[model samples]
Target chain A: HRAFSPGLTGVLPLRETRHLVEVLRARVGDRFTVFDGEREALAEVVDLGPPLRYRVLEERRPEREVGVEVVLYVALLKGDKLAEVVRAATELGATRIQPLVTRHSVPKEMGEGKLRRLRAVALEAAKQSGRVVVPEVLPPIPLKAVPQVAQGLVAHVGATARVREVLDPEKPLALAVGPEGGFAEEEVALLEARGFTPVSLGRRILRAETAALALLALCTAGEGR
Target chain B: RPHRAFSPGLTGVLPLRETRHLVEVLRARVGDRFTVFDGEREALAEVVDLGPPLRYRVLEERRPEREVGVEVVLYVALLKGDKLAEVVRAATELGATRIQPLVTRHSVPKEMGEGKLRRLRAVALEAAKQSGRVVVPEVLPPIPLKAVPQVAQGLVAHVGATARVREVLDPEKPLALAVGPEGGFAEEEVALLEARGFTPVSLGRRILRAETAALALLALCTAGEGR
Candidate 1:
């Protein structure tokens, strides 16, 4: 099934319709599960023409979703590392992903082409991982322009406080992890001004991708609060 | 700086392994600076003589300790391609005490070879240097399912488990975490591990990959103590 509303009728786009006809050879009346990021339903293929149509027989809510709504402000990583982070972050229950353009960050443009690939990765990861909700991967934003939040923490190597000590179990969190070379002194000061306290994962230096996923893992595994 | 196991003071000629890495791999010349770790302390060295066995004159010494107090022996099932190497590097960066490769039912046995072992060691060494940690994680030979060492506290990642990892894990004690391969452990293998006193723990509703599960366990353990 494809992403659609709670009501009866729906139409899958050309790409998915092609997959149904060519790859799976799904004929009319073939039934499959359709998830709309929040809920899932059983639908039967009504037509095999342009904009493959489907009629929903039954719809039900998903079993489980992420308990915590974690927003990750991850710095732009080099090569396919950012892609890996997006995939892992989705599996680990991140609600939103904001690519941060920092002082030492990778200088890559976030065009629609790259965004489409990231969204596809997130959808696939959500399906495979049994996550009810797909995380939103936003375009790259400059570090200084990051919005201030009630409870937020910036991951810094030199921070004295641990993530567990600073994380509030009750409130929603916005976490920012720096790039490989790390944020400059002035950038750290700017984040500090926005009330984002610095927190450390541990003594070992984690790579950019590892740091982002590690934070998500901690949230998914809970803080023993 | 590369990983070197040597005495602090009496370092006239470096080992053949270190010499090759410095001269051939790193392309070092006379008076070039390099740092060497003797597992306890770090020493700054100057390249005084470059030979078949390169000579390095030790200079200043500083005691740098990056040892995680709680020992975590990660028992991970063997994976394909460079996935095992990636796990080794992440484990070293997160400060795992040791890594024990497990040969499970779904694991591809051909992927585990002497060449892969050597490559894993090199990855661990490079990870240690990059992470500013003096301790390099030991990558052991792949062993059978039943050969997993018995530890005081044992935890296994399972899909339908009831207990949460953070609830059962005690950072004060030595812990051993076991993660299965792609298809996960067999039913009999799970029973065998349960009989061996391994408690089943869950990592939420999502299904993580073998490498992701292993690293998540390591992160959970480190976070428990770091708090």
Candidate 2:
């Protein structure tokens, strides 16, 4: 549940045990893959208990890990699209996620239920992507409450400056991406005064989710030209 | 009606329609700042006098940053609902020089109308303005699978392809990338693309849906990410 390695035996949680045991009807000796962010292993079922036990058969390390720190502050978007963004952001190796509702955001608030679901979405995406680090999705915050980090860069539609102009991968970075309509002109004013440099990803208007992933990718996964 | 060659410190009179809107609708008196565009050039302007014909003084003028180094022509299979609009927006932002909506065997829309065509063009124009692009990528009329042209070195997003986008991408040259519908390009469609010399490319190991896949593929090819 906490830590896993080769030769270490562990018990599957009731939620997973129900799916594997009761639903899927798995018997003893059945093999499956298990992961706990840091370690991934092949395991054999040892018991039929509600909390099924599994013994590790083999282990493997992740091919790569997120090399830099990326804290993504995304605007609260409409519908279930934010969940989609969370999934992609994890695959792109964001270290942390903070949803913000800015002046221009059509969606004014986020519920605890939606917030919890976003966390689960991140977990599933992390497992599927074979990520060694699972990004934590934090609760929603208002635009005025966004905290300052080591390096803060905000993506705004009206900003003429490019991301390449101010990006320093060597430092810990926090990217603030606006909503569908992007940040309000007034909101951008406040962000600038608070030390967040406004930057543009490209020449075309990017959707809310696309903006987040593009910025995160450039920050984390960018390769040489 | 006056035509001035976008020079800084030059003053000009607003057109009749714009003058009425500024006075009757926006209620501008004088000394209000706004952006003026000639559809090709843009400048910072401030109202100098509030005559029946609005006059303004140009403060600054310069060409906006528009295109990326490479000319990426995106060939996206027509998707359902407003999904195609989403792809168009992402393609424009990712610096696609042109967007070609293709109809394949699995394509949801067999044809399109000028009504939707105008809407998509408006979408592109709004994106151009918002992203500060000096030009808008043309959204051409939809073409059938057989009609696709090989405009440049090509890359097609295929699910089975192990090659990453950068592997086949010659970023220095113009590119044409074709993406399939929700169920992906049919076998015959894939073969046709192969015949056009389009190399199959993969977005990543994790599977992505049609719209998301298109955006990710474009992102891989752009950001130009370095200055």
Candidate 3:
């Protein structure tokens, strides 16, 4: 059972058979944390079944997610930059990542099997960064057809508005960043037409990945003290 | 040749490295023009001598604001391999006044050899010039946690703290930010830093790598909105 704490017989079947068997070298005496999409359990290996049967010792709510949902709509940068963005964005608390095919960025066709590669990278980063939910990496979308979210900001270098000045952390937010040379003026206009307020990072021009991580850091830097 | 910034030059010959980069790489001829900036001021010059040591004289000069308004000393724990170089480059671009690497109890055991240290300095230098920074951040040698200097405005990245960076930062004063390694600082190391006046702050629930935390802290404390 997925939620195998109290219901049936305290037994849970694992889907990641390779990791439990080969990657982790988890033997019958090994104990580890097991997650089923939304929930986690303190589990122990019971057998070497291909399904990798395990016994659930405890069930608990995962504590790694941010309080607010963060959706990032970043431009599809060339080379391995999109993968870079996916890795860091997952670590910095993004709930979902939407790659935008802007005028100055890449095309929608990212070859075959590329999206799965990015998704795998996100999952690994989430595991490493102690994230409860692996960020969902969506297929590429053009700038003009972007679905407008209630609280979204575009990273425009010259904009007077800072992320802290306008961000409402209690609610969910979506952020958009540009390419190496940044977004085209009219492309930004299209996003603004969709009600995305433009924002700036700082005076010095930051690289594409740097800008993305900085904005994610600021957007997710919520109240504490 | 690689270390010197061409300045106080009403007219002077370029160093060997710059000459090679100019004459061989850029393929500039006798009359080609380029700009020379040494943090304080920038001078526009034209090529006069394209010899083994290329030469030029100033055509015009102007100064630009090339730094953040305040001083921030970024203290990061020693990392593995060339990792510190990446942090140093990003820190200079974000206007970190100084960078001090720490040897925490839980940090990686990589040696900061003299070659690596010099490479880190070169990275900082290149990033500063590329980001149009007037002064490159000084990257110091790695020190033990107890040897950290005390500053009036200080912040540290602790995993479970409710305290935040924006509240503890002093906009106009010199500040220091300390970030731990991948395994993070030992409790004793954090206490040592706290004794040095570093107010522990949490970025968020997501655990960031040492380099990510270092850059994020630098960006928050040193970049934008006068702080």
Candidate 4:
């Protein structure tokens, strides 16, 4: 099940076979749904060996992916907060994630070693969330040195307007959120230089993680319209 | 400084907790001024006596309503670990009016006590203070699956539902949103809820954790509005 390819026949992994035969009490000729992360199909259980095989009955591609590309650039938070964000954001249909280090950001020494685990987290989340494409979690980058993207918005607490007012629902967006202590004034200026417009969620002060997930939810709700 | 709950027109001594935060933490002087909220009003006050129990004199009262006009009553299924507590905190900050914990067929039953209730209330209070909310969302006792209170506009979030939540969420009226547990509601449970006028809704194609679903639902309902 880990590796998906286009074919009429496929073999289920040992663990999956155990789940099908023991847990679900699946028998030969029983039909079940199988997704290849890109395509979904109904398969008939042909053989119940230690390694089970299935014959594809029907296959169809569904457009259940995120329409707009949302790149979440979040400041490095303390502990496993970033992991939680990745999981929730993936569920909310974010296309990408970039962990940034702002002026007042929490110091996390995330080398290549750390990103592998986080990337796996995204993959598992994608699988659980029924997403066809897994969101990519990029390596940690400094806030000032972030790459320029088309439409960008910096979530600042002191902004005068709402995010919904400034957001163009038609275009893909790159949203930047600050650390727990928030971005320095000069840091915000850097974002502006990179064409990131300052936007506000509301008057209430949400936690760093809460703010990130709220923005994602708002975007997902927008997509529902 | 933490905003202590205060009564209007009452010049009284502060509690031991307040004095500890005022004198020891904030290092406030005898004449130092501060603000106190009474869930309805925000009053400016000055410290008159910095004793073991600090004393304050109310100077002025201004009625500033920071609470959201939209009332969101979240009927959340009880989750394991500290997930429920986290949901309560996030829900309070997101301007939920009430939190009603539900026991679904898949929920792991647990005993509730005064201690747990007090801790949850304190958590809500802290979240309100952090979010600058004058009114704290009330946390109700956990209710059984069959005892859900009837509301005019009620929605049950199910994974297989096709209709999006935004289509059903009404901004004009008070709303009650129900989120199920990890294993989700049983078929009979869903039928009973549907019979009780609860419409099935979906957040998206993705499967969300129980806590995340509740918070996301609250955020979606509270969007485009101020707290």
Q: Pick the candidate with the highest TM-score.
A: 3
Candidate 3 residue pairs in backbone clash:
none
Check candidate 4 and list the clashing pairs. none
TM-score to true structure, per model: 0.70, 0.56, 0.71, 0.68
Predicted candidate 4 versus true structure: per-residue lDDT over B1-227, tens digit per residue: 54543333344676565578778988988888887653335677888898878888888876655556767788888888777889999988788779888888898755567777788889999999987787888998888878986678888776445456656767688888788888777778877788766887766656677888888777766733333
Task: Report the C-alpha lDDT of model 1 over B64-162, residue by residue, as the tens digit.
Answer: 556677787888889988999999988888888799999998887624779999999999899988877777888988999898866789899765454
- Docking quality of model 4: it rates as incorrect
i-RMSD per candidate, Å: 8.0, 8.0, 7.8, 7.1
Weakest ten-residue segment in model 3 chain B by summed lDDT: B1-10
Query: Which structure is stronger by DockQ: 1 or 4?
Result: 1
Against the true structure, candidate 1 reaches a TM-score of 0.70
User: What TM-score does the predicted chain A of each candidate obtain versus native chain A?
Assistant: 0.68, 0.67, 0.69, 0.69
Candidate 2 per-residue lDDT, tens place, B166-215, comes to 55667687878888997788878988998987887755434345776677
User: What does candidate 2's lDDT look like per residue over A1-225, in tens digits?
Assistant: 222222344787676778767767889888887764335677888887868888888886634455567788889898888998999888777778999988878887888998889999988878866675688998888988887666878775334565656777677778888888777656766677767886656544466777788776555443321
Task: Report per-prediction Cα RMSD to one decimal.
Answer: 16.9, 14.5, 16.7, 14.7
Local accuracy of candidate 3 as per-residue lDDT tens digits, B78-105: 8887778889988888888889888888
Instruction: Report how far off residue B175 is in candidate 4 (Å).
Output: 2.4
Per-residue lDDT tens digits for candidate 4, residues A1-225, read: 222323334787676778768887778898887653335777888888868888888876545566778899998888888888998888788889999988888775577877888898899998887787999998888887887767788766435455566667778888888888877767877888888887656546688899888877766643442
Please name the candidate that would achieve the greatest lDDT relative to the true structure: 1
By descending TM-score, how would the candidates be arranged? 3, 1, 4, 2
The better-scoring model by TM-score among 2 and 4 is: 4
Please give, for residues A169-218, the per-residue lDDT of candidate 3 as tens digits.
Answer: 77788888887767776777778877788775665656778878887887
| Better TM-score candidate (3, 4) | 3
True lDDT of residue B205, candidate 4 = 53
Candidate 4, B163: how far from true, in Å?
Answer: 4.4
